[PDB]
């Protein structure tokens, strides 16, 4: 069925965008580690 | 096949819940920016 194939193609695109945002969040969450290390270093 | 259509409907629901938690994490991760700005402002 073309309706099923089109729905699968739409799900594949959503998962690709979801996977990209997770990798970005992982990188952005690494900043929060550096940001707290910078506050602790500059203060202490 | 109804089994394939039911599996697609289950995947669509899981992606909808996954997409909602990512947007929540993005908002909750913005708090961590404010929280570090509040610590740096109150201390420095």
């Amino acid at each position: 069925m073309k309706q099923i194939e089109d729905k699968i193609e739409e799900i594949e695109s959503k998962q690709k965008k979801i996977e990209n945002e997770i990798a970005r969040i992982k990188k952005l969450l690494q900043l929060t580690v550096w940001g707290i290390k910078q506050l602790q270093a500059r203060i202490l | 096949m109804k089994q394939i259509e039911d599996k697609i409907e289950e995947i669509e629901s899981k992606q909808k819940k996954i997409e909602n938690e990512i947007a929540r994490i993005k908002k909750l991760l913005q708090l961590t920016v404010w929280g570090i700005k509040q610590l740096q402002a109150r201390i420095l």
Partner: antibody, heavy 117, light 108 residues
Framework: QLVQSGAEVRKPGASVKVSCKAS????????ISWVRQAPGQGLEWMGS????????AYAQKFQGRVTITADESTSTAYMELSSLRSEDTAIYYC????????????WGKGTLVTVSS | DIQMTQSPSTLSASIGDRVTITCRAS??????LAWYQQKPGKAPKLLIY???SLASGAPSRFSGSGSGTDFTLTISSLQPDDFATYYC?????????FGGGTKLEIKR
């Protein structure tokens, strides 16, 4: 990718402010560090900003006379060094600390700064 | 802070040989270490991040290892492009500190 300001010449006891412009994607989820290298000497770290937080961490030997700022509206990073001395003459670089790697991937061309009378 | 000691400061080797240099930290830094290569009149170029993961464009002959305090950069077969100065840098905690530096000389 990383464009800096032109060369500068100052007198001792005076200050300087060097700019370094990056992309908008750099000012979001990345960090910029300032590293200098005297002629013939080795690399020496000075400080870094985490632009999305406004935090900064400087070096001990430079603590009190170094100031690093960054405005996200122009995506430019500024480095201000006060109480200049003759040994401060060095080539100052700006690198983009990449958190996923834990290292600096892109670098700038470097700026010729001379502290002499 | 954390002190990075590069031994040796200079090295003399010929093309095709294998060379091994170290970069010891004053305290435990896990895999946080970044190796660089600088040419005269050039900005440093990133080679190895996380002490093992090679970077983009870095040829496979380079090599990183070590964790905690003792680390090691090694090359399998030297080539004229490989002869330059190398600086290690830790990212465990601030302030970030570089190493002394290891200049690679062409033996003749």
């Amino acid at each position: 990718q990383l464009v800096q300001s032109g060369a500068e010449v100052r007198k001792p006891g005076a200050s300087v402010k060097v700019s370094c412009k990056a992309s908008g994607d750099t000012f979001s989820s990345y960090a910029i560090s300032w590293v200098r290298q005297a002629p013939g000497q080795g690399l020496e770290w000075m400080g870094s900003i985490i632009p999305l937080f406004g935090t900064a961490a400087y070096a001990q030997k430079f603590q009190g006379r170094v100031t690093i700022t960054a405005d996200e509206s122009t995506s430019t990073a500024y480095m201000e060094l006060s109480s200049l001395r003759s040994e401060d003459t060095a080539i100052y670089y700006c690198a983009r600390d990449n958190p996923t790697f834990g290292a600096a991937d892109s670098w700038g061309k470097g700026t010729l700064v001379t502290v002499s009378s | 802070d954390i002190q990075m000691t590069q031994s040796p400061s200079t090295l003399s080797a010929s093309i095709g040989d294998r060379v091994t240099i170290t970069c010891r930290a004053s305290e435990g830094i896990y895999h946080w270490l970044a190796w660089y290569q600088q040419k005269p009149g050039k900005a440093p170029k990133l080679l190895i991040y996380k002490a093992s993961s090679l970077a983009s464009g870095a040829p496979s002959r380079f090599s990183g290892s070590g964790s905690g305090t003792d680390f090691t950069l090694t090359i399998s077969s030297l080539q004229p492009d490989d002869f330059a100065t190398y600086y290690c840098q830790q990212y465990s905690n601030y302030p970030l500190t570089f190493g002394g530096g290891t200049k690679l000389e062409i033996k003749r």
